[PDB]
Amino acid sequence: PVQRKLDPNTPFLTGMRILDVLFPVAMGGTAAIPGPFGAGKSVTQQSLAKWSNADVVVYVGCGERGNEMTDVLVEFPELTDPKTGGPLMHRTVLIANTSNMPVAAREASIYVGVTIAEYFRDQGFSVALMADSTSRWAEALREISSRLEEMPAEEGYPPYLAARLAAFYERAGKVITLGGEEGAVTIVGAVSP
Amino acid sequence: PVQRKLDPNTPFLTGMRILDVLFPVAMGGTAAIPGPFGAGKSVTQQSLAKWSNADVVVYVGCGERGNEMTDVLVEFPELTDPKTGGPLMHRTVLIANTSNMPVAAREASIYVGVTIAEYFRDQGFSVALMADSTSRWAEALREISSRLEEMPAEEGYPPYLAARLAAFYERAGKVITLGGEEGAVTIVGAVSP
Amino acid sequence: MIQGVIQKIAGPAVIAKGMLGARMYDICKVGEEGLVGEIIRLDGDTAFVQVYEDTSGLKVGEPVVSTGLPLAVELGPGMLNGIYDGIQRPLERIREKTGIYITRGVVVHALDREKKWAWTPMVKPGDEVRGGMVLGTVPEFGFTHKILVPPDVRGRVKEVKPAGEYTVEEPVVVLEDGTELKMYHTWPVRRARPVQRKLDPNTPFLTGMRILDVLFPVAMGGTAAIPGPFGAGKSVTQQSLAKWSNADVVVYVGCGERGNEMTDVLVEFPELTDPKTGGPLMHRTVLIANTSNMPVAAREASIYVGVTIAEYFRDQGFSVALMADSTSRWAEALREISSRLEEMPAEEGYPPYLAARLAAFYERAGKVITLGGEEGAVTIVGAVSPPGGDMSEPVTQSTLRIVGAFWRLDASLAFRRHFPAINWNGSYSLFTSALDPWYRENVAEDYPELRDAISELLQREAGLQEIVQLVGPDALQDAERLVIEVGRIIREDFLQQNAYHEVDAYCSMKKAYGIMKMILAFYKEAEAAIKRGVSIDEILQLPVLERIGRARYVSEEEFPAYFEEAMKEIQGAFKALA
Amino acid sequence: DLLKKEYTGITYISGPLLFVENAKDLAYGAIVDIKDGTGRVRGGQVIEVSEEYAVIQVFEETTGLDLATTSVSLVEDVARLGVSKEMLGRRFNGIGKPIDGLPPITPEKRLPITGLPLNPVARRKPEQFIQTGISTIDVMNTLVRGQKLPIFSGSGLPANEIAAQIARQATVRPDLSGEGEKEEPFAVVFAAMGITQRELSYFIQEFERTGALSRSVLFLNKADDPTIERILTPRMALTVAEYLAFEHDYHVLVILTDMTNYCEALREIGAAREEIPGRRGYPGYMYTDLATIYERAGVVEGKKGSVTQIPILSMPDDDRTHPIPDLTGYITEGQIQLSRELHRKGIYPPIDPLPSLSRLMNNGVGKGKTREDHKQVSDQLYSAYANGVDIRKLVAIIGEDALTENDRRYLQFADAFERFFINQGQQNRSIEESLQIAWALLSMLPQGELKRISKDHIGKYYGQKLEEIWG
Amino acid sequence: KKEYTGITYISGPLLFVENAKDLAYGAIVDIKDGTGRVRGGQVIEVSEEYAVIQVFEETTGLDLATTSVSLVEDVARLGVSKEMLGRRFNGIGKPIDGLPPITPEKRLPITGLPLNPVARRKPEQFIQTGISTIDVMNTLVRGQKLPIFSGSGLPANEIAAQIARQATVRPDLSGEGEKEEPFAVVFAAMGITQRELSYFIQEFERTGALSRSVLFLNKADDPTIERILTPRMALTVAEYLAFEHDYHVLVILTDMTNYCEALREIGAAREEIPGRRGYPGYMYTDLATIYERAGVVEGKKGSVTQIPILSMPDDDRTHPIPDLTGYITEGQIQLSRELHRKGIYPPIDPLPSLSRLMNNGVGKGKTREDHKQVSDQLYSAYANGVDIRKLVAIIGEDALTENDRRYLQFADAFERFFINQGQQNRSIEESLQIAWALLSMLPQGELKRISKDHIGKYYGQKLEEIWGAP
Amino acid sequence: IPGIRAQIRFIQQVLEQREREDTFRLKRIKGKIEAREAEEE
Ligand SMILES: Nc1ncnc2c1ncn2[C@@H]1O[C@H](COP(=O)(O)OP(=O)(O)OP(=O)(O)O)[C@@H](O)[C@H]1O
Ligand SMILES: [Mg+2]
């Protein structure tokens, strides 16, 4: 619960000229970053984590490949926070997964991450959530739906895919916490068709 | 019942150049007028109703807009019958089952219209039946079949749709009525693929 | 002897109750008429029986008795030149017994019992004998027919009848234990006949058609599939293989295909001549005919009976060819039976075990060291009939993964009356490499090189068609147009073949090698000429293209001289250009 | 048989089905009479029997039935029809009840409508040559007596007209074949399924005009008639045809008017029974069911009769991959496929030579049957027309001016072909005139490009120009 | 010991047993018929009322009066030991080479336990497969999953056997290096015809490759459940060796399309509603559990690689099997029909191929410092050459520039001397030498991608070095 | 190119529709089979 949702009146400075100037994302906003191969998505996301104004950064890997997840896990610890000069891992939370892990875990990864971000928001911080590979999460959802023998829609995805995507992307937004402070959650969800 | 079916050998002058010239339909024949939305099904059907040379015209709004029936009501009384001189409404019988009215009533509307046309045929007149949309009749059949838990054939329609359409259309034809007089019925059924 | 009573009749299926003790896949007699049927499911004390005959007119309460044995075929002398129904019932005897119509319940033995055969014993009293050894010999239409000890029999021979005339029922040999080995022996159709070893294919199965025998060969132990939409010429191709193949025995299995094809075979083959033996061609063939309107459940039985007969003749030492006329109809029969069983379909209604059944059927092919020590083989050439030409049907895709050769027919070629109508791009063959040593020793020392050159030319032509479809066939340069024209020559003068001609119907490997030599030499000289400035518009007008085109029709004996003349003419024609 | 057995205790009526509880005695495939309170009697056939109940498919609509007063009684353990020599010149409904107003026929025998398969050994090679009078059929898609040649129609093409023309003009040619001269005409068995009054009136008028009603049998199942009756009409018609042909030495020509309606009825029954559908919702056994109808044609050894078939079939979306055309093509022997493009241009009969086919042609054309040059002429015409159509497709992308002289010649040949060979109105071309026109057209191409034909025939027939025949 | 004789239903591949509460789900059972023959089976559903058993092979002799079901093992396991090297197995573990059965060191569950993401580490060393088009342009690094997409008729089996015979590690190139680093190749063939089995056995036994490889060969006519189990048994052995004896194991899965078809058949047998395009809904997770058992773990010197081989059904890249394999794996080596028909072997097309981990297994101390640039330059030059070759069929050779003619010659020389290496085994240095010789045909200064230092150091050799001695 | 793209989309939609109908029929027959099994096993 939140006391009241506010309008997007302030920006989420990502620290990169193109994004901060030509395509700004408001604090409490939502953005999508399709990731092809060789486009340096990992570097862009690490830059967002390092330099953005968000106090705490939550990274969610829904169903990433094994070795991509290994790279992710072995690259954050070496990152250096530019503000305090210490390790960046002292202000981030990593939710890791791989394709061979149980389907329920992959399906619930994004919800776990967003709930943690909401907690850190209620405290009075500004949280940046980066749900990588929401397409893999959609795959987990499809597998779960087929396990229950639901009727598919479109390319085999369950008819309620948009409902869940909205339920996840609408928890973002800057709000006045129940305690009267001000906090925000900004979601940057990748898409990998 | 009827004595003998005859061979259609006179035209059902529709008052439209293209139809009456390039693609004629005989007095006892049948015609279908498929067309996507915004093509002219409604205006074409109303033109057929207004100007055709049928002695009596039966219009069956089997699941279409109510404004169409209202337009017929509010305009036809003012117009003049080409052949009798009286108000145009005195030779038309409407059977209005708008879209938002009960679904199952569309089948009944089609059958009632064709039966009334058959009656006025038996009296010696030449009738013209304008079925506003048989796709809505097909939808009614599909819904009832779904409730019965029958097996759909294609696109969900019941397997016996072809027989029903055949029975409905075969009632058209020029005839020596049981009283000895000559009569006919013309069916111009619209389809909305 | 289990007995029960019918409880439910639904099409070709019958559910019998009181059959507690029956075994899966055992032949049961249904009703008073004793219609044959096979158990395919057991529920409580009920057995689900599929009837190999029309069940119209049956009633509930009629008796059902199980024989306790699975479907079996009588293997022995008397099968060649015959024609059989799905479950090995002679059709000439049915024709004599009933009228011109097949009728239910006829009981007729597979092998004649009243005919006497000349027996010449090979074994001697008191000698060892093992499964698959040759007891004796019996003449049959110029073949030498070997009587084999059943695959699972052992002992020492007590007494053997002296050479003389006997019937198949005579116990020619008696073992010590007391068992009597007659001139035949039953064998379950669903069990592969045991063998000693499987050999790698190293010989070609000369089908007699240039395209199949050159670009897409099939080995002596190979398996090939010939899919194609209706009208593409599957039946003509398979009949050509039956007529001209080099196999010693040809088993033709009409699994649910047009009835008139079997009549064509019966009426034609007795008049043609066997390529090798020289006697009538019908003396080397066995027909297992199950037309489309014959009972559906019998299609699987027909396929299995055919393959088992082929395996028997292999065990005798011959090399056999098995032409399955349509396996898609076998799949359809399985689908109808599954529907009657109310199972869970996969894909387009086919039961899940279809792929396993097809793999089991195909894996019986191969060259083998029979149990007797001799060497035999079985080649399976099974057609496929996808609906609407779809090569994505489950049947065709399941066949792609177990067949070593693939001969994909095309509708576009068939429309132009261009036969055999093999889509060159889609077909393939995996026996090409393993057969090279044979070609280098029995066709020509460089045959593989010419085959590869022709394939490369066709591939280049296919690559250039991508451009021709874009910028017209006249915007190309000279070399590319020459490639296109040589591709046309290859299509129209080498691959094409009129199966109804008196000479072109058959084409030995020497003839194909000669034509390939001619085309390649022409292409080499033409390319040289184009380099030096000649115009293609005049290369296509040379008077040697006519001879290259007519090279197909020259007889098999005149070909060497004609080929020498053609090569000289090629050299002369392209030398005169200066 | 003499006594009458009745089964009350119906427990279910939905669509075309009907369940009887204690019908253990009823036999699979039996025919039953359903009687309602008003006293009307309908027909039905058992399609499943068990100790608990028995399924009956009602031929006529189920209106008026009830679970209280309705009763089911047996008629015959196996469906039968009372064939007889006297039924020529009579009209019957889909079940066999006369509609011509004449009394019922005194049967000579009762035969099972389902029939029995013809023994492959007892079959005979179909050899004789039928001169359909249409050049596209006689020359390129020859029809031989004892053949199954469906006419793949379209939504609004004139398939019925072509069938009537073939029935009217079809005559065998003993003189060419060297057989004893005789003029025994064809007997027609006309099985109808869901025919609209228009087509039925057309067929009746054509038969009356040609005088074929004196020697034809009609099985009419009009569109307004019950749908499930269609499952029986083909079988009864073919039973009559086989009886006449193989017990009286008749040359019977069977015309089935719309196999698509038959497939619709079969789909209705199958879906009502929960069958595992194949493609497009049709039942999985449609292939076998259609085979049992088509494959009842052919020729038998030692009998002078012959049964020919021309099933007219309307491809739904002018689509050749629809399940009905696919199965019919896999069962029948070739097909004569009409095309819409030719029809719009005004060609009649709009037979498309390229997709058509005839698998029994080679048995009926050749030396001593029609003429020495038949097969080669047909093959060369196929090749030339195919090249013409390919060049016609090329033009629409590369422009007329770009063509060479050879391409222009082939294109002109294709046009002249479509306008002089296919298009023939209602005239009755003999085989000789058709071959003459074929050679006249082939003369347009250079002599060196007729690769399929042998040089002897080229020398003998090449040269005569089309202008001589017309203009 | 205990036999459940209460059979009450047999149909197709299933049979039911009453009073079978004691049996555990997923257990393996032995079904004994009247004649004494024994068939296998696996429980697929256990209930208070009855237990459903899926039978291996067939049910041709069973009946409800004599059939008896007895337990064999609670959960499927495989005996594993170092001695497996040099043996062959049928997919269930029973030997088929005629040698005595192995005496297991320990018995491990076949179904794999997921690796902990925090216990993995980046792939950073390369495997020299001996095929230039893979070792140079699409390197294969230890811990990578690099499927080989093929077609219906292309020679996937020959390439698989070649990689099995030639694959080796190169410890010397890594710094000071080590004298030895044990290497093994686990071969898992699923649904392969008898001909393919004879070919594989002969190829492995002909050159002593069998002395360090384990073969799990499954015939096409063998039961489908064995096909499902084969990859899992092979990967169990691979994991055992790699992570308990410090081996560098390479796993080749011969046909994943056959595995997917068997999975579909099994899913249909158990009454499961199919998902997309008729395949099981959970195919993604199953293929993940097979693929993602490879990697490199921290604190262990071993490694597991995979080279799945899948034949795209109809050359469709969007078919579910290739698509999911693409999602779960890194890269693909795509064979081409055009190159094959042209006579090139192996017919690997560098243009659509990709290796996503190449940049990590290449550089100083691993291969040579010019590897990455050489690969990039070869890719660009080949693409340009093939485009120019298409153009020449329209515009004619004379109307090209000089450099376009150079590219046109380079494309042909590349196709003939780089890809078409036949059966010869090429070390990484030889492949790089041939690459530099081919690039030398292009005019220096048009090698934009390469730095000046490398161009100076290596440019200039003659293609005749390999032509005169292939 | 847009024409071919439109045709591709149309064919994809048709095939997806057919697959969806097949799954629906499979689901209903599975329901009937489950009902029968529960009633009588
Ligand atoms: N014959 C006509 N002359 C002039 N205007 C016409 C004619 N036919 C149609 N129109 C115009 O086009 C509009 C669409 O025609 P109409 O209402 O008959 O559509 P329709 O085919 O029945 O479609 P829908 O089902 O979407 O209503 C008409 O409202 C009128 O504006
Ligand atoms: Mg409208």
Author numbering:
A (entry chain B), B (entry chain C): 194 to 386
C (entry chain A): 1 to 578
D (entry chain F): 2 to 472
E (entry chain D): 5 to 474
F (entry chain G): 169 to 209
Q: Can you provide the manuscript's text about this entry?
A:
Vacuolar/archaeal-type ATPase (V/A-ATPase) is a rotary ATPase that shares a common rotary catalytic mechanism with FoF1 ATP synthase. The thermophilic bacterium Thermus thermophilus (Tth) possesses V/A-ATPase, which functions as an ATP synthase in vivo. In the V/A-ATPase, the V1 domain (A3B3D1F1) can function as an ATP-driven rotary motor and ATP binding, ATP hydrolysis, and ADP/Pi release that occur simultaneously at three catalytic sites of A3B3, respectively. This cooperative reaction produces conformational changes in the A3B3 stator, which induces a 120° rotation of the central DF rotor.
For another cryo-EM map at 3.2 Å resolution, the densities of a sulfate ion and ATP were observed in ABclosed and ABsemi, respectively. However, there was no density at the catalytic site of ABopen, where the first ATP likely binds as the first step of the reaction. The structure containing ATP at the ABsemi is termed Vsemi1ATP. Therefore, ATP at the catalytic site of ABsemi is most likely derived from ATP bound to ABopen. This indicates that Vsemi1ATP is in the state after 120° rotation of the axis, following only one ATP binding to the catalytic site on ABopen of V2SO4. In other words, Vsemi1ATP is the state following 120° rotation of the rotor in V1ATP (lower to middle). In contrast, the density for ATP binding to ABsemi in Vsemi1ATP had to be lowered to 1.5σ for visualization. The low contour threshold of ATP binding to the ABsemi of Vsemi1ATP is associated with a high B factor, which implies greater flexibility and/or heterogeneity within the nucleotide. These results imply multiple ligand conformations of the nucleotide binding to the catalytic site on ABsemi of Vsemi1ATP in the initial reaction process.
